[PDB]
Amino acid sequence: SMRLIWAQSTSGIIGRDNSIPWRLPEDLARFKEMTMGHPVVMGRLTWESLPASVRPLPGRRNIVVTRDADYRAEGAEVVTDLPDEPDAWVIGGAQIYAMALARADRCEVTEVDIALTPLDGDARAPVLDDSWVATTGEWQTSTSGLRFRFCSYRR
Ligand SMILES: NC(=O)c1ccc[n+]([C@@H]2O[C@H](COP(=O)([O-])OP(=O)(O)OC[C@H]3O[C@@H](n4cnc5c(N)ncnc54)[C@H](OP(=O)(O)O)[C@@H]3O)[C@@H](O)[C@H]2O)c1
Ligand SMILES: CCc1nc(N)nc(N)c1OCCCOc1ccccc1CCC(=O)O
């Protein structure tokens, strides 16, 4: 029932130092069009990784998963388990993806062809296996020259 969206190095990395280690104007655009008008479900560290200007993300119901129910998240709902929201998007991070993967039938992935080598402590995308039906988009080039591609997985 759950559906997930993320961007990742082609090496598997979604986050380093509690932020994303690249800027990609096209992926920001696509993520925004996929989630706008829908609840967005995220974990506590993704919440505080947001740039202040976009905390909470505009035009969407923001839901933060945390162990502390009295946690302060101004302008977001706080919950203590993964919610069963009918139109939510699971937007990260690495812990929340691992929890959700088993209960997921859809994955919308951005891939980034970047010099990024795994480091102790990185946040990593889930491993998608031969149980998924894959739809692979062609490689594209961003203004900066960084090359990326959109992929779809369904179950
Ligand atoms: N590139 C992308 O597409 C993408 C997308 C999303 C995030 N990110 C990156 O991912 C990194 C952060 O991800 P992360 O894995 O470190 O953090 P996270 O998964 O977003 O949040 C982890 C926190 O969620 C809470 N939590 C986890 N499981 C819970 C449960 N079962 N019940 C209640 N609360 C629970 C805990 O916070 P408490 O300590 O409050 O309990 C836990 O420490 C950052 O670098 C961010 O930029 C990247
Ligand atoms: C944008 C990175 C990103 N890209 C994809 N494909 N999926 C995600 N779940 C994701 O993470 C969403 C959470 C991080 O959101 C941001 C991080 C930095 C700047 C702006 C935004 C989102 C801004 C907005 O949606 O209005």
From TrEMBL:
<feature type="binding site">
    <location>
        <position position="19"/>
    </location>
    <ligand>
        <name>NADP(+)</name>
    </ligand>
</feature>
<keyword id="KW-0554">One-carbon metabolism</keyword>
<dbReference type="Pfam" id="PF00186">
    <property type="entry name" value="DHFR_1"/>
</dbReference>
<comment type="pathway">
    <text>Cofactor biosynthesis; tetrahydrofolate biosynthesis; 5,6,7,8-tetrahydrofolate from 7,8-dihydrofolate: step 1/1.</text>
</comment>
<feature type="binding site">
    <location>
        <position position="7"/>
    </location>
    <ligand>
        <name>NADP(+)</name>
    </ligand>
</feature>
<feature type="binding site">
    <location>
        <position position="96"/>
    </location>
    <ligand>
        <name>NADP(+)</name>
    </ligand>
</feature>
<dbReference type="GO" id="GO:0004146">
    <property type="term" value="F:dihydrofolate reductase activity"/>
</dbReference>
<dbReference type="InterPro" id="IPR012259">
    <property type="entry name" value="DHFR"/>
</dbReference>
<dbReference type="InterPro" id="IPR024072">
    <property type="entry name" value="DHFR-like_dom_sf"/>
</dbReference>
<comment type="similarity">
    <text>Belongs to the dihydrofolate reductase family.</text>
</comment>
<dbReference type="GO" id="GO:0005829">
    <property type="term" value="C:cytosol"/>
</dbReference>
<feature type="binding site">
    <location>
        <position position="93"/>
    </location>
    <ligand>
        <name>NADP(+)</name>
    </ligand>
</feature>
<feature type="binding site">
    <location>
        <position position="44"/>
    </location>
    <ligand>
        <name>NADP(+)</name>
    </ligand>
</feature>
<dbReference type="GO" id="GO:0006730">
    <property type="term" value="P:one-carbon metabolic process"/>
</dbReference>
<dbReference type="GO" id="GO:0046654">
    <property type="term" value="P:tetrahydrofolate biosynthetic process"/>
</dbReference>
<feature type="binding site">
    <location>
        <position position="99"/>
    </location>
    <ligand>
        <name>NADP(+)</name>
    </ligand>
</feature>
<feature type="binding site">
    <location>
        <position position="94"/>
    </location>
    <ligand>
        <name>NADP(+)</name>
    </ligand>
</feature>
<feature type="binding site">
    <location>
        <position position="66"/>
    </location>
    <ligand>
        <name>NADP(+)</name>
    </ligand>
</feature>
<feature type="binding site">
    <location>
        <position position="95"/>
    </location>
    <ligand>
        <name>NADP(+)</name>
    </ligand>
</feature>
<keyword id="KW-0521">NADP</keyword>
<dbReference type="GO" id="GO:0046452">
    <property type="term" value="P:dihydrofolate metabolic process"/>
</dbReference>
<feature type="binding site">
    <location>
        <position position="14"/>
    </location>
    <ligand>
        <name>NADP(+)</name>
    </ligand>
</feature>
<dbReference type="GO" id="GO:0050661">
    <property type="term" value="F:NADP binding"/>
</dbReference>
<keyword id="KW-0547">Nucleotide-binding</keyword>
<feature type="domain" description="DHFR">
    <location>
        <begin position="1"/>
        <end position="155"/>
    </location>
</feature>
<comment type="function">
    <text>Key enzyme in folate metabolism. Catalyzes an essential reaction for de novo glycine and purine synthesis, and for DNA precursor synthesis.</text>
</comment>
<feature type="binding site">
    <location>
        <position position="46"/>
    </location>
    <ligand>
        <name>NADP(+)</name>
    </ligand>
</feature>
<protein>
    <recommendedName>
        <fullName>Dihydrofolate reductase</fullName>
        <ecNumber>1.5.1.3</ecNumber>
    </recommendedName>
</protein>
<dbReference type="InterPro" id="IPR001796">
    <property type="entry name" value="DHFR_dom"/>
</dbReference>
<feature type="binding site">
    <location>
        <position position="45"/>
    </location>
    <ligand>
        <name>NADP(+)</name>
    </ligand>
</feature>
<feature type="binding site">
    <location>
        <position position="67"/>
    </location>
    <ligand>
        <name>NADP(+)</name>
    </ligand>
</feature>
<dbReference type="GO" id="GO:0046655">
    <property type="term" value="P:folic acid metabolic process"/>
</dbReference>
<keyword id="KW-0560">Oxidoreductase</keyword>
